[PDB]
Amino acid sequence: LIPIEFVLPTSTPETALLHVAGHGNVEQMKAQVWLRALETSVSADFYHRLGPDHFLLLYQKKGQWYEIYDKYQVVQTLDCLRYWKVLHRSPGQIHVVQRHAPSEETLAFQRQLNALIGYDVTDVSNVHDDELEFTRRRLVTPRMAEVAG
Amino acid sequence: EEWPLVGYHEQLTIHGKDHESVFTVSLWDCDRKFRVKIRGIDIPVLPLTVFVEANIQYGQQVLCQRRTSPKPFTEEVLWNVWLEFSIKIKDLPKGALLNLQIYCG
Amino acid sequence: WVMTCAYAPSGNYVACGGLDNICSIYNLKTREGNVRVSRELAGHTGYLSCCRFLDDNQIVTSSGDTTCALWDIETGQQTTTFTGHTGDVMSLSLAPDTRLFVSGACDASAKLWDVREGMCRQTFTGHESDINAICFFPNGNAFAT
Amino acid sequence: SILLDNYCHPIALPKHRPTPDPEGDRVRAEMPNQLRKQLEAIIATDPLNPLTAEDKELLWHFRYESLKDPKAYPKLFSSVKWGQQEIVAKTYQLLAKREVWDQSALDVGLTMQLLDCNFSDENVRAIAVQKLESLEDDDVLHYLLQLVQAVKFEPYHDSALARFLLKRGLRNKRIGHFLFWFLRSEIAQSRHYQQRFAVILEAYLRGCGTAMLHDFTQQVQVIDMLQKVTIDIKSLSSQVISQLKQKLENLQNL
Amino acid sequence: TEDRIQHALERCLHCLNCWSLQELVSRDPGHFLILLEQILQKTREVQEKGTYDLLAPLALLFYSTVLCTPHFPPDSDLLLKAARTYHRFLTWPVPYCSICQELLTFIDAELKAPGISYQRLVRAEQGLSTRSHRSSTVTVLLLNPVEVQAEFLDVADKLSTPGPSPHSAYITLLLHAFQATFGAHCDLSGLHRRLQSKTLAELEAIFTETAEAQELASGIGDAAEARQWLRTKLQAVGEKAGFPGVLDTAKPGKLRTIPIPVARCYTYSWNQDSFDILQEILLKASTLRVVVFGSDRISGKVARAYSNLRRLENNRPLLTRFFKLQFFYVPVDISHYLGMLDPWYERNVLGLLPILADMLLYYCRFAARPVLLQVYQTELTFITGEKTTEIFIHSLELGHSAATRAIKASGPGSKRLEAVPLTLQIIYSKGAISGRSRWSNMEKLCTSVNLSKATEALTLNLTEVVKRQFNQISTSQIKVDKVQIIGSNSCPFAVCLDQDERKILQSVIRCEVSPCCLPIMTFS
């Protein structure tokens, strides 16, 4: 029932005020937001064309952006909620952003790195789980702090 | 770089809850025994007697041991058998290794 | 890590204990004639250091929690608790009269206890180090440490 | 193939809660100088000491005596039984009061036994790495080969030793260079862990500066060309020498 | 009584014993609480010992018993104790947790509303409908006289007879409804006599005002409150009704086992194998129960009509617009296959008013576990270019065997009417457990091709002719799941599906094979 006003991917930009089922976890909120976008939105055709994987849930913490990578995370593990309660941000806002494809700069950089290493890092042909890719998405923040320091 | 940056036993137990408000089951409530299903093996080509042995391990430790019986040395073999472990599902440590050893004779 | 044992005067029971912090009482004359554990005298917070049977139903035990205790085998409960020691209690010895017993500790001192009441009657010193063993003089008016 | 029986709900092991454990709190006097004398003779043995279940017992009961003796730690946790659930709760309450380890003497010939094969826990290695955090750059450099060789045993991919190497390579350059070359050698060799090392190395190469990237690139090019020439040469008199000269001159041209 | 029930239970889970025990308990209502306590204790013996085997029979026994128990003491702890017993199984594999969650829902219904389950089940069975909550579970029987057995025919005839009446059904349901709640403070005879004098229309108005509270009280969180507020609801109803003093009497009114009024059973003779009979019967919120007798040959026909009906109704839902289909198999090769597999099936329903018809009005109400065989989708091609994907379910045939079948199934023609080999291309995928399929391709001079049973696997009898003259035959069975047969237009072959001659097909140039509401059921 937690009220969260969502920044919609498309429009003045349109924002949807909901009552998130915070009892469960992020999956419930995903289903609720999907249905609300399907029904309320005047541009509901846009999102009807697009499937579920064409949008991501990013939230602004202290200015930067964080990813809700695991839907299995429970509501309490969503630090955004506690952050808002301390800041009393009711309703909170989670930016529903539209996905995008990689650019050529990134692809060339990755090929360079893979040449240096001698072995692809984006290979997913010998893994029975996403341990590796989550290791990679997690090592970022320690590296950003190390470099900033 | 554009890549955006990515409980305890009291809150995650069945006891004290109605089944219709249950979503998780702590690994310690499970008093049962660990058991595995070894359906079989299939190799494109064999590069005598043969038989499996499964183990749980925690840092070169062998908490429990299990095995099976001799079998024909084909390119593919089946049991659908179950192997049950002594260690309860609440006794498992975070980091157990399920070793799977095809021996031959 | 058993550390002590004590044949009962009756001859029916034997007790032992150690690191387990429990005085496990064993029955030699069991219904089936096997060696079955009658009781697990738990409650001590340290290793069981020594124990002596008063009878088939009573037994005194010392431990590493710096206290002694009288037990009732039936209830498995510390009848009396002998507080006052400031060190791990290594040994004890029942007088011929079961109403008094002494106990030796690492504080280089011994203490005379009243089994009936549970008080320290006298405290003897003189040792420069831990007391490892203690027992009553045959008559019961003296003891060596 | 295998099947692990399913569950309508997922099985989420929590992490042990450390709570006031007063067996250490209110056992504070000193123990029999006999027991201490038979314990501290065992502790002062080789680090290859076989701990008999006798020894593991005597030490597992004296679990606040050997908590102020760092020279005993890889003999204390070599006894803890990991097959149970109360044992591990007690051992995760034992490590909750460690004021005689953090402020101990930073002996790094010891911390290299809390990061060995026999230990796979998630906090034994954490205290080991906490000890190593206070080393200095040259000290790190001296042993870095084994620290690399000591990320193989980290049961998972993401761990604390790996993040340690990462954080070390982004504030020095000699460390960065030698780390790069060792990780590259293993990725080219350690097929078993090559994916893990590749993850580590690539997470490293996004932080260093552009110039270091270019220097790596050029070194890699030179080694590659030299490997080509070498493999060509060992395909088989003075004609071979002249062919060496021709290939080297062309490489200069290439 | 206590020890006899316990020992009969020990016999129950080790062929008619299930029945002996339902009867024994049905005698005196006391027995029910004894059996329930015993079951519970045994289910904790399993909650703590192991042997998953014994969870399903015990859950079924508890469900069956509590389903008819005439009344539970208001102070009894049996249901809450049972809830605590089955709330510890969630840490078991699937489906045990599913079984137990469903059973706990049933216990929730019990506490929150007594006698709700029995009243719902019967009101579905008897076709009586409230203006709002309509229910119909009509069991129709399919029987071919010459295939079915005498006794069975007698059972069908008896079931066809409309034993119960709407007025008698309403009387019985009001009786059980008042006796589950009030129990010993209600004198059966009393009500029953202040009832028969009434009329069908009012008996309905009442049984409706009753069932409605039996629901509204079930759907509330305070099962104990809901309970007393339902005793109170029924009391406030029975006062107006006109039988006051019958209920809430300071005498120890005795309890008795009110039976289960049999459901609306219709019989229709099956001089057919197609399920068009079912649509024709239809031409004459709800479910439909179809029960059929299992002969050996009938197997093929039955499964082929299963496939035909499924695909037909997929093309256009007609029989699935108001009724949900439930098909039951009764033994009299699949019978052998299921006989040795499920010990509960081999104990209760494999062997089998009369005992047979009680165990058949029993089996049919409880079993809800669909166990299905891998239907095999096969698309054929002809010289004319006709392509369709009709299924066979037991075996397939091709070559000269199907032609022989037609040769003899022609009757008039079979009185007026060597295996030339077939140069055919065989492309079969030897399946791999790990998912690494292995392709192998040949062209061989084979006469007849016979797909037979072993996701599932398909064994295939090949009949190779190395030489014509008494053709040579080298029969080899090879496991295959996806098999492609290519046959030149100038080599049409006699293909038969399911061994039934009614579907012997010719002119085929190509046959593609690959493993793929109305369920068929299995007891456990």
Side-chain angles (χ1 to χ4, degrees):
Chain A
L1 306 177
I2 301 178
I4 296 181
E5 181 186 12
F6 289 75
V7 181
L8 302 178
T10 61
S11 178
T12 310
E14 308 307 329
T15 73
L17 180 64
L18 288 71
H19 284 253
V20 174
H23 308 81
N25 59 16
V26 179
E27 184 28 44
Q28 284 181 5
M29 176 178 73
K30 292 180 178 179
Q32 186 173 355
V33 297
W34 206 241
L35 295 174
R36 272 267 300 177
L38 288 184
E39 293 177 350
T40 42
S41 50
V42 178
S43 174
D45 300 5
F46 174 83
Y47 305 88
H48 275 74
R49 309 150 201 168
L50 302 177
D53 295 358
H54 300 166
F55 301 101
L56 296 174
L57 295 174
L58 296 174
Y59 69 97
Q60 290 195 87
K61 182 192 302 182
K62 296 179 178 180
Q64 80 181 136
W65 292 92
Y66 287 76
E67 177 186 353
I68 309 171
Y69 181 97
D70 278 330
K71 72 179 69 181
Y72 312 153
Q73 292 294 350
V74 203
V75 126
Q76 273 195 351
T77 54
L78 301 174
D79 306 87
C80 62
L81 296 174
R82 181 177 181 170
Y83 176 77
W84 294 334
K85 293 304 191 65
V86 170
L87 295 174
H88 326 281
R89 287 182 58 185
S90 176
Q93 298 182 28
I94 292 174
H95 293 80
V96 182
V97 175
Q98 52 181 358
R99 204 174 188 274
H100 293 84
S103 295
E104 293 177 350
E105 291 197 6
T106 59
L107 302 184
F109 189 73
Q110 182 59 239
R111 293 182 183 174
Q112 178 183 357
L113 293 188
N114 289 337
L116 278 180
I117 297 170
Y119 181 107
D120 175 14
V121 301
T122 45
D123 177 7
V124 299
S125 71
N126 190 18
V127 212
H128 55 278
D129 198 350
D130 72 326
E131 190 178 351
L132 291 172
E133 296 302 320
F134 205 68
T135 306
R136 290 179 58 192
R137 289 304 307 268
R138 291 201 69 190
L139 288 178
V140 179
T141 308
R143 178 168 64 248
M144 196 277 263
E146 192 69 27
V147 165
Chain B
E1 204 73 347
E2 299 177 353
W3 281 356
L5 302 182
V6 288
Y8 278 92
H9 188 45
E10 289 74 355
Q11 316 166 19
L12 311 179
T13 188
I14 56 184
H15 300 346
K17 301 289 185 177
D18 68 321
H19 64 128
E20 296 289 344
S21 62
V22 182
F23 43 75
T24 185
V25 170
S26 158
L27 176 65
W28 291 324
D29 301 343
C30 311
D31 297 74
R32 319 188 299 91
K33 307 163 67 63
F34 206 94
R35 195 186 58 171
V36 71
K37 183 178 183 60
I38 66 125
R39 292 181 182 275
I41 59 179
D42 68 326
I43 183 172
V45 176
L46 297 168
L48 300 169
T49 62
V50 292
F51 56 94
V52 181
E53 185 188 347
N55 303 328
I56 294 170
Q57 283 193 8
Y58 196 72
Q60 313 265 115
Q61 280 214 51
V62 188
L63 301 190
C64 304
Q65 170 175 114
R66 293 296 182 268
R67 59 176 182 183
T68 66
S69 58
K71 289 286 288 188
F73 206 163
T74 75
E75 289 184 335
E76 177 183 359
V77 191
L78 298 177
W79 304 268
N80 302 31
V81 64
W82 287 102
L83 297 182
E84 198 144 33
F85 298 141
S86 316
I87 186 170
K88 293 181 181 178
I89 287 181
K90 61 179 177 183
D91 279 338
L92 282 181
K94 175 181 177 72
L97 215 57
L98 175 61
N99 192 255
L100 307 173
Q101 293 176 50
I102 308 300
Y103 292 87
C104 174
Chain C
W1 209 238
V2 68
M3 290 176 69
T4 187
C5 59
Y7 226 131
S10 32
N12 315 318
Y13 280 44
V14 304
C16 70
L19 192 126
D20 44 299
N21 292 26
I22 297 165
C23 182
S24 314
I25 278 63
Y26 282 74
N27 194 26
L28 311 179
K29 303 180 186 175
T30 315
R31 200 61 46 191
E32 302 133 274
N34 281 36
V35 283
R36 208 192 198 187
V37 189
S38 302
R39 272 283 168 184
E40 298 284 40
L41 302 180
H44 275 303
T45 72
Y47 65 92
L48 204 85
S49 60
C50 165
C51 55
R52 296 298 186 216
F53 275 110
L54 292 173
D55 55 54
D56 255 311
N57 197 44
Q58 281 185 124
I59 178 165
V60 191
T61 76
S62 59
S63 178
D65 57 51
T66 74
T67 75
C68 290
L70 170 60
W71 299 77
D72 175 27
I73 294 167
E74 222 74 295
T75 58
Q77 201 75 308
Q78 288 187 14
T79 309
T80 311
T81 301
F82 304 84
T83 56
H85 266 288
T86 68
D88 302 356
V89 192
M90 295 306 300
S91 185
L92 68 87
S93 174
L94 302 166
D97 303 12
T98 59
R99 61 174 178 176
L100 288 174
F101 84 89
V102 296
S103 87
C106 301
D107 55 50
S109 77
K111 295 197 171 216
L112 182 57
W113 304 92
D114 205 338
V115 176
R116 303 278 173 171
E117 320 308 337
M119 76 188 72
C120 171
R121 299 226 146 202
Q122 295 158 249
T123 295
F124 312 80
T125 58
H127 279 297
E128 304 188 54
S129 186
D130 304 353
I131 293 183
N132 301 298
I134 191 172
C135 65
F136 263 100
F137 190 88
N139 72 357
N141 295 15
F143 66 93
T145 58
Chain D
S1 304
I2 55 172
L3 159 57
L4 295 180
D5 319 4
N6 307 62
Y7 304 88
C8 280
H9 301 97
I11 293 175
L13 166 58
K15 192 174 182 180
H16 301 42
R17 168 60 64 77
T19 61
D21 180 10
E23 165 161 18
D25 187 316
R26 304 203 165 188
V27 179
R28 194 163 184 170
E30 277 195 0
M31 48 179 293
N33 299 347
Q34 188 190 179
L35 296 167
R36 182 182 316 285
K37 154 176 174 188
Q38 0 178 26
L39 159 154
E40 297 297 5
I42 291 179
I43 291 175
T45 50
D46 327 22
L48 266 177
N49 179 100
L51 291 172
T52 301
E54 295 173 340
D55 306 4
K56 293 179 179 179
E57 202 178 352
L58 185 47
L59 291 144
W60 181 226
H61 192 221
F62 291 124
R63 34 175 284 266
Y64 287 81
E65 285 288 321
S66 304
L67 178 125
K68 305 198 174 169
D69 173 7
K71 290 180 179 179
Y73 262 69
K75 294 160 181 180
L76 167 62
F77 291 102
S78 295
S79 68
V80 173
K81 289 181 178 180
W82 305 101
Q84 298 178 334
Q85 160 55 29
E86 293 177 350
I87 303 301
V88 177
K90 293 179 179 179
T91 305
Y92 276 58
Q93 293 179 48
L94 178 176
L95 285 170
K97 179 179 61 56
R98 60 185 184 187
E99 293 176 350
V100 199
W101 173 263
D102 297 349
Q103 301 176 37
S104 167
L106 173 49
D107 176 4
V108 292
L110 174 67
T111 306
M112 280 194 67
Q113 305 191 161
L114 295 195
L115 300 179
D116 194 356
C117 60
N118 299 327
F119 296 66
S120 311
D121 191 314
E122 188 170 346
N123 281 25
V124 186
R125 314 186 78 90
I127 72 179
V129 174
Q130 267 306 307
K131 292 300 295 180
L132 275 179
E133 292 177 350
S134 196
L135 267 189
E136 291 307 336
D137 289 331
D138 189 11
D139 294 0
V140 175
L141 278 174
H142 276 282
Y143 322 99
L144 185 56
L145 184 50
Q146 307 294 4
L147 293 178
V148 181
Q149 298 292 327
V151 199
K152 302 187 156 187
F153 299 130
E154 282 288 345
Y156 302 163
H157 293 333
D158 184 357
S159 43
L161 180 57
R163 301 198 181 189
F164 168 77
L165 297 180
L166 183 69
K167 293 165 185 291
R168 262 313 217 224
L170 307 194
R171 288 185 281 94
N172 173 287
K173 283 199 176 185
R174 294 186 55 90
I175 303 178
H177 175 98
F178 284 105
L179 172 158
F180 164 83
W181 264 109
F182 293 153
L183 290 179
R184 196 177 188 276
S185 167
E186 288 300 324
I187 289 168
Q189 307 155 214
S190 170
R191 41 155 43 182
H192 295 65
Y193 309 82
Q194 59 181 1
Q195 298 171 57
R196 170 186 298 178
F197 288 150
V199 169
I200 299 177
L201 186 52
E202 188 290 332
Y204 158 65
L205 287 171
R206 287 177 178 268
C208 65
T210 56
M212 206 73 212
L213 296 180
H214 187 3
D215 309 328
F216 289 147
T217 301
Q218 292 188 95
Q219 295 175 29
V220 170
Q221 289 189 8
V222 175
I223 61 171
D224 296 355
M225 297 184 116
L226 294 178
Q227 186 173 355
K228 299 185 179 182
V229 158
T230 311
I231 294 169
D232 184 1
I233 294 168
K234 292 180 62 179
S235 178
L236 35 61
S237 64
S238 295
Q239 301 173 352
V240 182
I241 301 179
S242 300
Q243 293 177 335
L244 170 71
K245 298 280 176 181
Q246 293 177 335
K247 299 296 183 181
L248 292 182
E249 294 175 6
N250 187 24
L251 281 203
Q252 269 193 339
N253 166 44
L254 292 175
Chain E
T1 306
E2 183 178 2
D3 208 2
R4 172 174 58 177
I5 292 181
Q6 186 173 355
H7 171 62
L9 172 62
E10 302 154 25
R11 270 187 174 181
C12 174
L13 41 64
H14 286 356
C15 38
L16 284 170
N17 333 326
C18 174
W19 173 98
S20 84
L21 181 63
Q22 287 300 154
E23 297 301 324
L24 173 57
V25 298
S26 60
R27 308 179 183 177
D28 162 29
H31 313 9
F32 290 88
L33 300 182
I34 305 175
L35 179 60
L36 289 178
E37 292 177 352
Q38 293 172 357
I39 291 167
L40 280 183
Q41 160 75 94
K42 183 170 299 302
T43 297
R44 290 192 296 274
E45 187 170 25
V46 176
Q47 173 42 42
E48 322 163 358
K49 186 183 169 179
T51 323
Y52 318 58
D53 315 356
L54 314 192
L55 183 50
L58 296 177
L60 294 174
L61 286 176
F62 182 82
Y63 189 60
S64 178
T65 302
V66 171
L67 187 61
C68 309
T69 279
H71 178 95
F72 281 113
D75 301 343
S76 176
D77 63 357
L78 194 50
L79 290 180
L80 292 170
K81 183 178 179 180
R84 293 182 183 174
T85 301
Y86 286 109
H87 188 69
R88 302 197 300 178
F89 275 93
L90 313 191
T91 82
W92 290 79
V94 179
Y96 309 115
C97 54
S98 299
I99 296 175
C100 296
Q101 292 177 335
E102 293 177 350
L103 178 63
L104 294 173
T105 299
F106 162 78
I107 286 179
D108 181 66
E110 281 277 339
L111 294 173
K112 298 174 174 55
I116 181 63
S117 301
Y118 174 88
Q119 82 97 359
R120 285 174 178 177
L121 188 85
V122 178
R123 195 175 74 260
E125 287 187 346
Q126 295 298 332
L128 331 180
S129 63
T130 63
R131 300 180 175 279
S132 301
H133 287 267
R134 301 182 180 176
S135 60
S136 172
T137 301
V138 170
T139 277
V140 182
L141 296 174
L142 253 189
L143 63 81
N144 197 352
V146 180
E147 317 295 14
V148 182
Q149 211 291 323
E151 302 305 337
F152 294 8
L153 295 174
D154 308 331
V155 172
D157 287 328
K158 293 179 179 179
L159 291 185
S160 295
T161 55
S165 140
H167 193 102
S168 64
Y170 276 117
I171 290 179
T172 294
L173 295 174
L174 293 179
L175 284 177
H176 179 278
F178 272 104
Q179 195 180 219
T181 303
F182 300 86
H185 287 201
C186 168
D187 177 4
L188 280 187
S189 178
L191 187 51
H192 166 78
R193 290 173 180 170
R194 311 251 169 191
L195 271 185
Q196 292 177 334
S197 57
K198 311 302 181 181
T199 62
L200 179 57
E202 64 190 333
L203 278 186
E204 186 180 0
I206 299 169
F207 171 77
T208 299
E209 193 163 349
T210 304
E212 283 180 350
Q214 225 152 357
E215 349 271 79
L216 187 145
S218 92
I220 301 173
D222 300 341
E225 173 173 29
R227 181 178 181 170
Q228 312 321 91
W229 182 89
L230 185 60
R231 181 177 181 170
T232 298
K233 180 59 174 172
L234 293 177
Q235 200 162 12
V237 167
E239 288 148 20
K240 182 183 175 176
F243 30 76
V246 178
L247 309 172
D248 183 2
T249 80
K251 285 185 182 176
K254 186 174 181 182
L255 321 181
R256 291 185 181 177
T257 303
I258 293 172
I260 320 173
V262 180
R264 296 179 297 182
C265 303
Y266 299 114
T267 307
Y268 294 116
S269 293
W270 210 22
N271 179 27
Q272 267 280 114
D273 287 306
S274 62
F275 291 145
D276 293 347
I277 190 174
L278 294 184
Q279 64 180 20
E280 293 177 350
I281 294 168
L282 179 58
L283 184 66
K284 302 296 184 180
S286 178
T287 55
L288 154 64
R289 285 211 290 256
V290 171
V291 176
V292 293
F293 299 81
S295 180
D296 312 359
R297 172 176 180 171
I298 288 202
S299 176
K301 293 290 201 314
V302 149
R304 193 178 52 78
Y306 169 76
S307 65
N308 290 340
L309 187 54
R310 279 167 67 101
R311 310 307 172 183
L312 209 166
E313 294 304 326
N314 280 329
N315 306 123
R316 169 53 181 173
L318 175 54
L319 303 181
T320 63
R321 295 189 301 178
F322 301 84
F323 300 91
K324 274 294 175 189
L325 295 174
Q326 295 178 345
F327 293 92
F328 298 88
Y329 176 77
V330 186
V332 61
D333 295 333
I334 303 179
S335 178
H336 185 52
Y337 174 73
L338 297 180
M340 302 170 294
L341 288 167
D342 188 0
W344 206 238
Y345 195 98
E346 179 178 359
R347 252 187 293 264
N348 190 339
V349 188
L350 173 139
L352 72 95
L353 326 181
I355 298 200
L356 159 58
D358 320 320
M359 193 60 103
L360 173 285
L361 288 165
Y362 174 109
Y363 157 65
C364 294
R365 279 167 175 166
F366 305 139
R369 188 119 297 179
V371 175
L372 180 63
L373 299 181
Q374 285 291 323
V375 301
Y376 283 103
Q377 76 184 15
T378 192
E379 183 168 7
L380 297 179
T381 328
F382 306 93
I383 184 168
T384 59
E386 229 294 307
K387 296 172 174 178
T388 300
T389 304
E390 255 305 346
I391 293 197
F392 91 84
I393 309 201
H394 206 303
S395 32
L396 195 139
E397 291 197 23
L398 183 158
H400 190 295
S401 295
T404 298
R405 293 183 181 277
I407 269 152
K408 294 139 182 188
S410 293
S414 177
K415 216 173 183 192
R416 182 178 180 173
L417 301 167
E418 180 142 30
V420 181
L422 310 175
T423 296
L424 299 171
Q425 305 169 45
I426 294 169
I427 294 169
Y428 64 83
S429 67
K430 183 178 179 180
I433 180 170
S434 54
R436 292 183 290 176
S437 57
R438 294 182 184 174
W439 290 101
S440 297
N441 182 341
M442 68 193 88
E443 192 181 32
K444 286 195 170 222
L445 191 72
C446 294
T447 34
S448 63
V449 177
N450 296 351
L451 285 161
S452 63
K453 183 178 179 180
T455 61
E456 286 177 9
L458 263 202
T459 283
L460 173 57
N461 277 286
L462 295 193
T463 304
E464 179 183 18
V465 172
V466 177
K467 182 171 175 183
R468 310 162 218 240
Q469 83 97 303
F470 306 155
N471 302 314
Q472 190 170 355
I473 286 170
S474 179
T475 307
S476 178
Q477 290 177 343
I478 295 169
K479 290 290 182 62
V480 292
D481 59 358
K482 298 180 182 179
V483 179
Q484 186 173 355
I485 297 160
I486 320 180
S488 298
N489 294 20
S490 62
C491 297
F493 32 91
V495 177
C496 184
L497 308 183
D498 297 312
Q499 311 177 11
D500 70 276
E501 67 67 38
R502 171 177 179 184
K503 293 290 192 166
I504 289 162
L505 298 182
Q506 194 54 70
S507 301
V508 175
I509 57 169
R510 181 177 181 170
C511 171
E512 311 187 24
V513 182
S514 69
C516 236
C517 190
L518 56 112
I520 64 161
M521 313 289 205
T522 291
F523 209 17
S524 297

